[PDB]
Amino acid sequence: PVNYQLTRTANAIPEIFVGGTFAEIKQNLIEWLNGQNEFLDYDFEGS
Amino acid sequence: DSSVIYRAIVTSKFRTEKMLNFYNSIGSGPDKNTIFITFGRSEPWSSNENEVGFAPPYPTDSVLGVTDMWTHMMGTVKVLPSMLDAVIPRRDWGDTRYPDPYTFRINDIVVCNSAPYNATESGAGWLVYRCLDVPDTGMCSIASLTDKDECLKLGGKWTPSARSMTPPEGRGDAEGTIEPGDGYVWEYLFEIPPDVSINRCTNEYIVVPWPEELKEDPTRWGYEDNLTWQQDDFGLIYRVKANTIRFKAYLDSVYFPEAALPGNKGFRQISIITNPLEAKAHPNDPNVKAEKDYYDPEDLMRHSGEMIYMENRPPIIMAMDQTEEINILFTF
Amino acid sequence: IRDKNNQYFPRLKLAQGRIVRTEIIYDKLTPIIIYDKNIDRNQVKLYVDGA
Amino acid sequence: MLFTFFDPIEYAAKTVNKNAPTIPMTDIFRNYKDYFKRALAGYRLRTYYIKGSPRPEELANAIYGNPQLYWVLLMCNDNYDPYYGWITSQEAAYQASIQKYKNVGGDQIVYHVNENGEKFYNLISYDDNPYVWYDKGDKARKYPQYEGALAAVDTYEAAVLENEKLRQIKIIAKSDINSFMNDLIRIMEKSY
Amino acid sequence: VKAPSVTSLRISKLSANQVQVRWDDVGANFYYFVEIAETKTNSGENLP
């Protein structure tokens, strides 16, 4: 349009729901699991 | 800073006189200005016109901005003094479509008697009242304080915390008190005849009479009875503190010679010029000041007179219906 | 009013329970939201504006 | 398997990202809770177990039932939240208290509890002053409430007071449950 | 006679060495000039 304030949107499912492609979930969990919290002390193994 | 210091303020009454000066300035003879409304600008600007927003070219007051205007002027109308009118903000008593229906500040003019939810007298009249006082309860204005009177000293604006039951019923000042019941002391000021209210008053503003139409009868305005220590106090335009004026004209009155152009392509910009000279064939002629009623802008000299106001607006195409209205409400 | 031998006849209406204020302050974000569930949603006057 | 019991259907999800792949999914959209409700008719007078233990979410394998059913306890209380619906370990509520108010206000006093249980909500005493309580606003005073005296429940106590009142549930008595569940199926096979 | 203040000022398609700015038209014949400034000075935070 002309004035940018008119963009808005149609009916839009927000990014909050949507839902996973898998591997992107793997990405976000690893960053939440490994980082910001633990810096692993985990007793399982390297793998 | 150590010096003599003086603290001075122009009174609001100065404005209403200035307003009263613009009126009476319309007349045929010299020293009486004559105002025109101009439309013009047939050709569209850009291509983004007809869209939403986008703004027009912002008009400038320079000589270049005037010259083109006179080239595009489609038509003009002469403002007669009759179609100009005084106006004031209207607060209809007990109307729910506007803030504080049942509450009122210390002095606020409020019309009643129009529409059923306020009744008071019959025989119409659209009665109006100044409201001289308020019940005292509720916290108001500056800081905290508490009580009304102390809040009335040290400036302050006190808002009553108690709804005022019933409209002002009487014909004379200070209609409150005089009974154990509540309410506060409204003060009648004039009346609006029903005939004028359907025409001259819109729902945003109520007319208040020029100190002329109050003559050739007062009675029509319900002012026929008044205290009047003075022989007259005739003009009440000062009593209300009327700060503003309002113009009205039907677009059938404006003159378009072409008559198919303004309809097909709209007038995109409106400007009002003062004191145009008539068409002069050559600079062989004496300067005459414009009179009669219409003036195809061909008959106006270019740059002939000075222009107080320019507007630029999207196309505002107009239908030929015998009712559409100009407004242009001045705040003087 | 007062009539004959001095007497007053208020007809006043009435309701049960207490009365409470809980003033606080308005903002454009936090909604008011009083709490106690004994509120009677019929009789209320919110004025709060000075009017 | 007293959930499920039907089929995966297919969940299209076509209203979002058209030509989305169909994914077989356990069928949670039947309005089960109604079947339970209508089937229960005639088995009522399910007594009040009172709980009595911060039984973890599943006591089904202890008290009535016990094929680790983990519900018919739910449908009892019409539980909207399977987590905070049941009562919790006493500390959990405390733990739950912080995360509730951690953002704003810190620890607080929610209401002052007159004897006979009249709650007040943002009513505040002044010590070293008159003994009468005031609202948290209109600091000019002039508008007292509750001339009497009472005692505040602060915050922790409230959450305890609020979740601890959540222990009573229906049962079906460990007697009917077999006969009951034997009905609850019949209504289900009925409508198809 | 202040010229109408610009409205809806947004950034789009910024890169490391290139950044683009956008704003509503606000008028036909006006002009617009811009100003650019660093804020953090050598990994510091500083006052306006």
XYZ file of C-alpha atoms in Angstrom:
670
model
C 0.000 0.000 0.000
C 0.999 3.637 0.567
C 1.122 4.155 4.327
C 2.924 1.213 5.928
C 0.458 1.196 8.845
C -2.135 -0.595 6.671
C -0.206 -3.878 6.354
C -1.829 -5.780 9.268
C -2.536 -9.407 8.255
C -5.286 -11.872 7.421
C -6.181 -14.731 9.761
C -2.750 -15.804 10.970
C -1.762 -18.735 13.155
C 0.997 -17.136 15.257
C 4.514 -18.541 15.368
C 3.699 -19.813 18.874
C 1.819 -22.824 17.548
C 2.804 -23.762 13.975
C 4.810 -26.830 14.976
C 7.955 -28.760 14.354
C 9.763 -29.978 11.251
C 11.712 -32.253 13.598
C 15.352 -31.237 13.203
C 14.650 -27.579 14.025
C 13.310 -28.952 17.318
C 16.623 -30.787 17.692
C 18.344 -27.429 17.165
C 16.337 -25.437 19.708
C 16.525 -28.148 22.369
C 20.301 -28.539 22.039
C 20.717 -24.782 22.439
C 18.426 -24.897 25.472
C 19.903 -28.155 26.759
C 23.529 -27.492 25.898
C 24.024 -23.807 26.631
C 22.641 -21.118 28.988
C 22.013 -23.789 31.679
C 24.230 -26.864 32.114
C 27.553 -26.822 30.208
C 27.251 -30.520 30.466
C 28.170 -32.332 33.644
C 26.191 -35.276 32.190
C 27.267 -38.768 33.263
C 26.076 -40.669 30.171
C 28.930 -40.324 27.640
C 30.371 -38.095 24.937
C 27.958 -39.626 22.427
C 16.963 38.230 37.331
C 16.188 41.409 39.275
C 13.951 43.817 37.357
C 10.404 45.079 37.363
C 8.238 42.205 36.132
C 4.631 42.482 34.998
C 2.278 39.574 34.444
C -0.361 40.173 31.835
C -2.856 38.107 29.875
C -5.269 39.048 27.120
C -8.839 38.264 28.143
C -10.975 35.749 26.294
C -13.443 38.548 25.599
C -10.841 39.938 23.204
C -11.419 36.979 20.924
C -15.182 37.273 20.664
C -14.805 40.912 19.691
C -12.253 39.932 17.061
C -14.836 37.413 15.903
C -17.427 40.171 15.904
C -14.952 42.175 13.850
C -14.724 39.593 11.072
C -18.468 39.676 10.900
C -19.638 43.175 9.922
C -16.540 43.205 7.710
C -18.662 41.738 4.914
C -20.401 44.395 2.859
C -20.728 45.968 -0.548
C -18.990 49.309 -0.063
C -15.271 49.896 0.433
C -13.656 49.232 3.823
C -15.944 46.156 3.900
C -14.066 43.037 2.828
C -15.625 40.482 0.493
C -14.639 36.845 0.827
C -14.738 34.204 -1.890
C -14.410 30.433 -1.787
C -12.411 28.921 -4.631
C -12.107 25.334 -5.711
C -10.348 24.517 -8.904
C -7.533 22.038 -9.440
C -9.229 19.811 -11.976
C -6.151 17.897 -13.116
C -5.218 15.022 -10.804
C -1.808 14.997 -9.123
C 0.430 11.920 -9.316
C -1.186 8.494 -9.575
C -1.290 7.753 -5.837
C -4.216 10.085 -5.502
C -7.447 8.072 -5.123
C -5.522 5.679 -2.872
C -5.518 5.597 0.907
C -3.484 8.127 2.829
C -0.556 9.205 0.633
C -1.072 12.910 1.412
C -1.444 15.672 -1.136
C 1.223 18.132 -2.198
C 1.533 20.364 0.814
C 0.447 23.829 -0.275
C 2.814 26.756 0.011
C 2.046 30.447 0.390
C 4.641 31.727 -2.084
C 3.965 33.540 -5.340
C 4.493 30.379 -7.376
C 1.878 28.591 -5.298
C -0.653 31.317 -5.991
C -0.021 31.622 -9.717
C -0.862 28.046 -10.690
C -3.923 28.124 -8.435
C -5.535 30.853 -10.500
C -4.819 28.762 -13.587
C -6.706 25.751 -12.232
C -9.663 27.483 -10.579
C -12.854 25.719 -11.683
C -15.344 27.939 -9.869
C -16.058 30.239 -6.957
C -18.914 31.401 -4.742
C -19.403 34.682 -2.911
C -20.043 34.408 0.815
C -22.976 36.535 1.836
C -23.206 37.624 5.472
C -26.483 35.784 5.960
C -24.917 32.336 5.548
C -22.295 33.001 8.225
C -23.194 32.250 11.860
C -21.830 32.259 15.393
C -21.376 28.898 17.090
C -20.399 27.454 20.480
C -19.704 23.945 21.780
C -22.977 22.207 22.633
C -23.340 19.854 25.571
C -26.778 18.300 25.545
C -27.978 17.699 29.054
C -28.142 14.069 30.016
C -27.070 12.750 26.629
C -25.150 9.503 26.898
C -23.239 9.910 23.636
C -20.942 12.582 25.042
C -18.753 12.547 28.132
C -20.049 13.426 31.578
C -23.778 13.349 30.796
C -24.932 13.848 34.372
C -21.984 15.827 35.781
C -20.843 19.360 35.083
C -17.903 21.620 35.844
C -18.322 24.932 37.653
C -19.382 26.971 34.634
C -20.333 25.024 31.488
C -23.107 26.088 29.140
C -25.427 23.148 28.541
C -28.422 23.065 26.254
C -31.454 21.136 27.412
C -35.023 20.572 26.199
C -34.122 18.906 22.892
C -34.809 15.166 22.507
C -37.062 13.340 24.974
C -34.572 12.285 27.649
C -34.603 15.902 28.779
C -38.043 17.471 29.038
C -38.297 20.700 31.132
C -40.600 23.173 29.341
C -42.620 22.370 26.241
C -43.233 24.590 23.254
C -39.658 23.715 22.260
C -37.051 26.436 22.600
C -33.885 24.408 23.240
C -33.164 26.081 26.553
C -29.574 26.822 27.609
C -28.060 27.215 31.067
C -24.659 28.237 32.444
C -24.513 26.197 35.668
C -23.151 28.443 38.430
C -22.285 25.865 41.110
C -21.997 22.139 41.879
C -22.616 19.759 44.750
C -19.538 19.387 46.869
C -18.151 15.899 47.003
C -15.343 14.010 45.312
C -11.671 14.765 44.793
C -10.891 17.301 42.126
C -8.144 19.125 40.241
C -4.805 20.079 41.651
C -2.981 17.727 44.009
C -5.451 16.486 46.595
C -6.891 19.132 48.918
C -10.336 18.029 50.046
C -13.273 20.409 50.183
C -14.887 22.384 47.390
C -14.415 25.943 48.637
C -10.720 25.519 49.387
C -10.428 23.851 45.996
C -12.129 26.902 44.490
C -9.559 29.174 46.038
C -6.060 28.553 44.710
C -7.558 28.142 41.257
C -8.861 24.622 40.785
C -11.645 22.952 38.835
C -14.082 20.999 40.996
C -15.949 18.066 39.513
C -19.089 17.037 41.370
C -19.139 13.389 42.362
C -22.947 13.384 42.520
C -25.052 13.031 39.401
C -27.392 15.963 38.933
C -30.947 14.704 38.774
C -33.376 16.469 36.362
C -32.650 19.291 33.906
C -32.868 22.991 34.779
C -36.558 23.861 34.790
C -36.840 27.628 35.115
C -36.665 30.876 33.157
C -34.420 32.920 35.450
C -31.048 32.989 37.084
C -29.978 30.561 39.799
C -32.825 28.090 39.432
C -31.308 25.777 42.001
C -31.492 25.929 45.777
C -34.860 27.004 47.268
C -35.767 23.414 48.175
C -34.208 20.571 50.174
C -33.538 18.712 46.941
C -30.212 18.702 45.161
C -29.223 20.115 41.816
C -27.250 23.173 41.227
C -28.186 26.662 40.371
C -28.211 26.696 36.584
C -28.647 30.108 34.976
C -30.970 30.532 32.031
C -29.403 32.198 29.069
C -31.579 32.785 25.994
C -33.376 30.201 23.874
C -33.140 28.672 20.393
C -36.266 28.752 18.225
C -37.121 25.382 16.704
C -37.066 26.682 13.145
C -33.435 27.753 13.264
C -32.235 24.604 15.000
C -33.200 22.306 12.145
C -31.126 24.457 9.774
C -28.487 26.541 11.466
C -27.416 24.193 14.282
C -25.570 20.968 13.645
C -25.158 18.415 16.397
C -21.627 19.564 17.155
C -22.493 23.247 17.669
C -25.478 25.398 18.663
C -25.907 28.856 17.197
C -25.842 31.952 19.396
C -27.386 35.057 17.829
C -25.446 37.938 16.376
C -26.265 41.205 18.193
C -28.364 42.128 15.177
C -30.917 39.373 14.726
C -31.622 39.853 18.430
C -32.990 43.120 17.120
C -35.839 43.089 14.692
C -37.421 41.172 17.631
C -35.741 39.633 20.668
C -38.643 37.339 21.456
C -37.907 34.673 18.849
C -34.721 34.004 20.801
C -36.387 33.810 24.201
C -34.331 36.792 25.318
C -37.445 38.986 25.508
C -37.208 38.918 29.318
C -34.026 39.733 31.168
C -32.604 41.461 34.241
C -30.637 44.008 32.186
C -29.426 46.733 34.517
C -28.343 48.336 31.253
C -30.987 49.486 28.797
C -30.021 46.563 26.581
C -26.948 44.414 27.300
C -28.340 43.600 23.940
C -25.625 41.475 22.367
C -25.165 38.349 24.445
C -22.462 37.042 22.101
C -20.153 38.141 24.907
C -22.147 36.438 27.674
C -21.519 32.933 26.316
C -17.873 33.723 25.554
C -18.556 32.649 22.002
C -15.109 31.978 20.621
C -15.920 30.806 17.110
C -17.975 31.209 13.961
C -19.326 28.764 11.377
C -19.921 28.967 7.635
C -22.440 27.007 5.588
C -23.233 26.937 1.882
C -24.761 24.488 -0.553
C -22.550 23.377 -3.417
C -25.403 24.145 -5.759
C -24.693 27.790 -4.953
C -21.068 27.715 -6.091
C -20.731 28.565 -9.759
C -19.069 26.170 -12.199
C -19.278 27.438 -15.803
C -18.224 24.135 -17.357
C -20.762 22.205 -15.222
C -19.665 18.802 -16.481
C -16.045 19.043 -15.285
C -16.404 19.408 -11.469
C -18.662 16.392 -11.501
C -16.460 14.184 -13.640
C -13.188 15.272 -12.031
C -13.191 16.606 -8.529
C -11.951 19.894 -7.173
C -8.845 18.859 -5.326
C -7.932 22.017 -3.443
C -9.972 24.790 -1.855
C -8.789 28.298 -1.074
C -10.498 31.496 0.034
C -9.354 34.835 -1.358
C -10.283 38.375 -0.370
C -11.079 41.488 -2.373
C -10.639 40.426 -6.019
C -10.800 43.044 -8.760
C -13.073 42.602 -11.751
C -11.691 41.529 -15.103
C -9.720 44.322 -16.741
C -9.248 44.099 -20.498
C -5.923 45.956 -20.379
C -4.108 47.972 -17.741
C -6.079 50.853 -19.245
C -8.858 50.608 -16.661
C -9.432 51.857 -13.121
C -9.405 49.377 -10.271
C -12.911 48.277 -9.278
C -13.827 46.017 -6.368
C -15.761 42.830 -7.014
C -19.530 42.800 -6.577
C -22.642 40.962 -7.734
C -23.167 37.304 -7.097
C -21.181 34.750 -9.101
C -17.930 35.581 -10.915
C -16.722 32.993 -13.333
C -13.038 33.111 -12.334
C -12.221 34.251 -15.855
C -13.636 37.604 -14.759
C -11.269 37.764 -11.807
C -7.905 39.429 -12.245
C -4.954 37.133 -11.632
C -3.470 37.662 -8.159
C -6.227 40.236 -7.868
C -6.718 39.846 -4.146
C -5.102 38.242 -1.175
C -5.900 34.744 -0.020
C -6.080 33.868 3.653
C -6.446 30.089 3.402
C -5.344 27.201 1.170
C -6.402 23.579 1.456
C -5.173 20.577 -0.509
C -7.326 17.458 -0.347
C -7.820 14.216 -2.304
C -10.307 14.434 -5.117
C -13.606 14.915 -3.193
C -15.673 14.301 -6.316
C -19.120 15.833 -5.857
C -22.559 14.595 -6.828
C -25.068 17.110 -8.179
C -27.585 16.516 -5.375
C -29.039 19.801 -4.175
C -27.679 19.109 -0.703
C -24.029 18.894 0.195
C -22.416 21.348 2.520
C -19.194 23.338 2.852
C -18.665 23.815 6.635
C -15.298 25.680 6.950
C -15.746 26.562 10.634
C -13.514 29.413 11.816
C -12.102 29.460 15.348
C -11.195 33.212 15.510
C -39.546 16.846 54.733
C -40.741 18.074 58.135
C -44.485 18.197 58.800
C -46.794 19.031 61.744
C -45.250 17.637 64.954
C -41.629 17.378 63.924
C -41.053 14.051 62.172
C -39.130 12.796 59.150
C -40.207 9.992 56.797
C -37.286 8.750 54.691
C -38.387 5.970 52.339
C -34.793 4.862 51.715
C -34.109 1.596 49.892
C -31.562 -0.865 51.215
C -29.315 -3.866 50.605
C -27.322 -6.351 52.655
C -23.600 -6.820 53.153
C -20.722 -4.398 53.536
C -19.223 -1.666 51.360
C -15.619 -1.353 50.172
C -13.587 1.010 47.981
C -10.101 -0.253 46.914
C -9.094 2.845 44.956
C -5.648 2.091 43.415
C -4.815 3.750 40.050
C -5.529 3.165 36.363
C -3.018 2.333 33.659
C -3.353 1.230 30.051
C -1.954 -2.254 30.792
C -2.969 -3.776 34.147
C -6.736 -4.447 34.279
C -8.525 -3.552 37.520
C -9.788 -7.025 38.496
C -11.079 -6.914 42.055
C -11.061 -10.291 43.780
C -13.593 -11.135 46.516
C -16.351 -13.239 44.960
C -19.100 -11.830 47.202
C -19.464 -8.793 44.920
C -22.992 -7.978 43.777
C -22.603 -7.034 40.123
C -25.972 -5.243 40.123
C -25.246 -2.399 42.558
C -21.961 -0.682 41.709
C -20.768 2.883 41.202
C -17.241 3.061 39.832
C -16.992 6.788 39.493
C -13.244 7.242 40.043
C -12.942 10.190 37.662
C -14.051 12.803 40.136
C -17.415 12.257 38.419
C -6.598 -48.910 26.532
C -9.763 -47.481 28.013
C -8.731 -44.326 26.197
C -8.015 -44.844 22.450
C -10.308 -47.767 21.613
C -11.113 -46.468 18.159
C -8.613 -45.563 15.445
C -5.992 -43.009 14.373
C -8.392 -41.218 12.024
C -6.084 -38.932 10.087
C -5.277 -35.387 11.103
C -5.203 -33.352 7.926
C -3.957 -29.992 9.250
C -4.826 -28.645 5.806
C -6.055 -25.308 7.163
C -2.366 -24.482 7.658
C 0.243 -25.066 4.977
C -2.057 -26.502 2.309
C -1.068 -29.979 1.107
C 0.218 -30.767 4.545
C 0.937 -34.457 5.143
C -1.665 -36.552 6.899
C -0.350 -37.949 10.177
C -2.173 -40.830 11.904
C -2.869 -39.729 15.456
C -4.457 -41.250 18.523
C -8.009 -39.996 18.477
C -8.591 -37.514 21.266
C -11.578 -35.805 19.648
C -14.635 -37.789 20.607
C -16.170 -35.800 23.466
C -15.301 -38.716 25.740
C -16.230 -36.783 28.857
C -19.894 -36.993 27.880
C -19.859 -40.769 27.430
C -18.495 -41.091 30.949
C -21.153 -38.697 32.201
C -24.127 -40.446 30.646
C -22.769 -43.933 31.325
C -22.292 -43.061 34.976
C -26.052 -42.696 35.400
C -27.202 -45.303 37.907
C -23.754 -45.971 39.379
C -23.860 -42.734 41.349
C -23.365 -42.261 45.079
C -19.670 -42.717 44.410
C -18.314 -41.911 47.835
C -15.847 -39.230 48.872
C -12.374 -40.666 49.176
C -10.996 -37.582 50.971
C -7.616 -38.557 49.516
C -5.332 -38.047 52.495
C -1.995 -38.587 50.783
C -0.127 -36.397 48.304
C -0.608 -39.350 46.144
C 1.217 -38.705 42.989
C -0.956 -38.256 39.982
C -1.760 -41.957 39.820
C -3.340 -43.652 42.808
C -5.438 -45.690 40.392
C -3.117 -48.667 40.855
C -3.710 -48.523 44.620
C -7.355 -47.592 45.289
C -10.353 -48.449 43.092
C -9.502 -49.717 39.664
C -5.786 -50.696 39.656
C -4.938 -51.601 36.138
C -2.910 -48.393 36.422
C -5.922 -46.659 34.897
C -4.745 -43.101 35.790
C -8.259 -41.804 35.192
C -11.890 -42.302 36.058
C -10.218 -40.256 38.744
C -9.960 -37.400 36.246
C -13.492 -37.656 34.882
C -14.601 -37.576 38.518
C -13.550 -34.008 39.197
C -13.956 -32.735 35.639
C -10.295 -31.846 35.844
C -9.218 -29.231 33.343
C -5.510 -29.429 34.205
C -4.109 -32.941 34.741
C -1.054 -31.410 36.438
C -2.273 -28.842 38.955
C -5.731 -30.371 39.155
C -4.892 -32.965 41.781
C -3.460 -31.933 45.074
C 0.300 -31.793 45.218
C 3.131 -32.402 47.632
C 2.967 -29.744 50.319
C 6.226 -28.236 49.098
C 5.020 -28.142 45.488
C 2.458 -25.449 46.281
C 5.188 -23.451 48.000
C 7.351 -24.064 44.946
C 4.339 -23.052 42.874
C 3.959 -19.901 44.956
C 7.280 -18.361 43.924
C 6.938 -18.781 40.170
C 3.515 -17.168 40.439
C 4.648 -13.961 42.129
C 8.338 -14.084 41.181
C 7.895 -11.476 38.459
C 6.051 -8.784 40.415
C 5.516 -7.845 44.030
C 7.617 -10.517 45.598
C 5.966 -12.152 48.564
C 2.771 -10.421 49.595
C -0.418 -10.555 51.644
C -3.422 -11.531 49.586
C -6.209 -11.081 52.166
C -6.695 -10.631 55.901
C -9.334 -13.269 56.804
C -11.746 -12.049 59.427
C -12.836 -14.765 61.785
C -15.958 -16.336 60.274
C -13.975 -16.077 57.028
C -14.690 -12.684 55.466
C -11.961 -11.932 52.943
C -10.772 -8.380 52.367
C -8.248 -8.031 49.536
C -5.949 -4.975 49.502
C -6.991 -3.788 52.929
C -4.133 -2.513 55.096
C -3.629 -1.751 58.784
C -1.601 1.075 60.233
C 0.447 0.191 63.280
C 1.421 2.992 65.701
C -1.800 4.553 64.466
C -5.498 3.753 64.843
C -6.088 0.020 64.882
C -8.575 0.156 61.994
C -7.785 -1.157 58.540
C -7.600 0.821 55.301
C -7.508 0.128 51.580
C -4.214 0.284 49.713
C -5.278 3.569 48.158
C -6.948 6.790 49.204
C -3.940 7.326 51.462
C -5.724 10.391 52.829
C -7.610 7.720 54.826
C -11.156 9.077 55.543
C -12.690 5.790 54.295
C -12.074 3.002 56.793
C -13.227 -0.579 56.393
C -13.772 -3.390 58.871
C -13.390 -1.637 62.216
C -12.551 -5.039 63.719
C -9.338 -7.015 63.589
C -8.189 -10.134 61.739
C -5.020 -11.885 60.548
C -3.399 -11.925 57.121
C -2.705 -15.167 55.268
C 0.252 -13.665 53.275
C 0.900 -15.781 50.124
C 2.404 -19.221 50.878
C -0.433 -20.063 53.260
C -3.012 -19.172 50.616
C -1.616 -21.522 47.977
C -1.546 -24.216 50.648
C -5.059 -23.256 51.701
C -6.126 -23.280 48.057
C -4.667 -26.574 46.895
C -5.379 -28.424 50.135
C -9.105 -27.841 49.704
C -8.796 -29.775 46.415
C -8.666 -33.209 48.023
C -12.032 -34.894 47.632
C -12.882 -37.091 44.643
C -15.441 -39.656 43.541
C -14.535 -43.313 43.349
C -17.060 -45.767 41.844
C -16.115 -47.919 44.803
C -13.854 -50.579 43.211
C -17.046 -52.618 43.040
C -18.817 -50.978 40.099
C -15.717 -50.117 38.095
C -15.764 -53.458 36.319
C -19.529 -53.406 35.828
C -19.269 -49.684 35.100
C -16.508 -49.935 32.505
C -18.520 -52.809 31.062
C -21.256 -50.256 30.415
C -18.967 -47.406 29.379
C -17.885 -49.453 26.393
C -21.442 -50.255 25.366
C -22.390 -46.610 24.908
C -19.267 -46.167 22.812
C -19.854 -49.059 20.430
C -23.423 -47.780 20.272
C -22.674 -44.660 18.313
C -21.055 -45.434 14.935
C 5.020 25.958 10.043
C 6.583 22.604 10.894
C 6.666 20.256 7.928
C 4.696 17.079 8.692
C 6.783 14.695 10.739
C 7.608 11.467 8.957
C 5.676 8.381 10.013
C 6.210 4.621 10.120
C 9.992 4.546 9.890
C 11.213 0.987 9.382
C 14.372 -0.852 8.388
C 14.328 -3.576 5.754
C 16.896 -5.934 4.211
C 19.825 -4.823 6.325
C 23.147 -6.570 5.757
C 26.501 -6.116 7.452
C 27.776 -3.471 5.036
C 24.387 -2.413 3.635
C 21.246 -1.255 5.426
C 18.050 0.142 3.942
C 15.506 2.468 5.527
C 11.871 3.012 4.592
C 9.226 5.537 5.587
C 5.806 6.693 4.447
C 5.508 9.309 1.725
C 4.364 12.210 3.977
C 4.085 14.497 0.980
C 4.742 15.179 -2.681
C 7.227 18.052 -2.765
C 9.098 17.698 0.524
C 12.645 16.444 0.989
C 14.169 14.143 3.575
C 17.649 14.085 5.005
C 18.972 11.444 7.325
C 21.483 10.983 10.122
C 23.483 7.910 11.104
C 25.397 7.294 14.305
C 27.351 4.646 16.112
C 26.124 3.911 19.625
C 28.309 1.320 21.340
C 31.875 2.633 21.351
C 34.411 -0.208 21.289
C 32.101 -2.669 23.059
C 30.902 -0.035 25.526
C 27.459 1.346 26.283
C 27.168 5.126 26.276
C 24.611 7.860 27.011
C 22.642 9.842 24.419
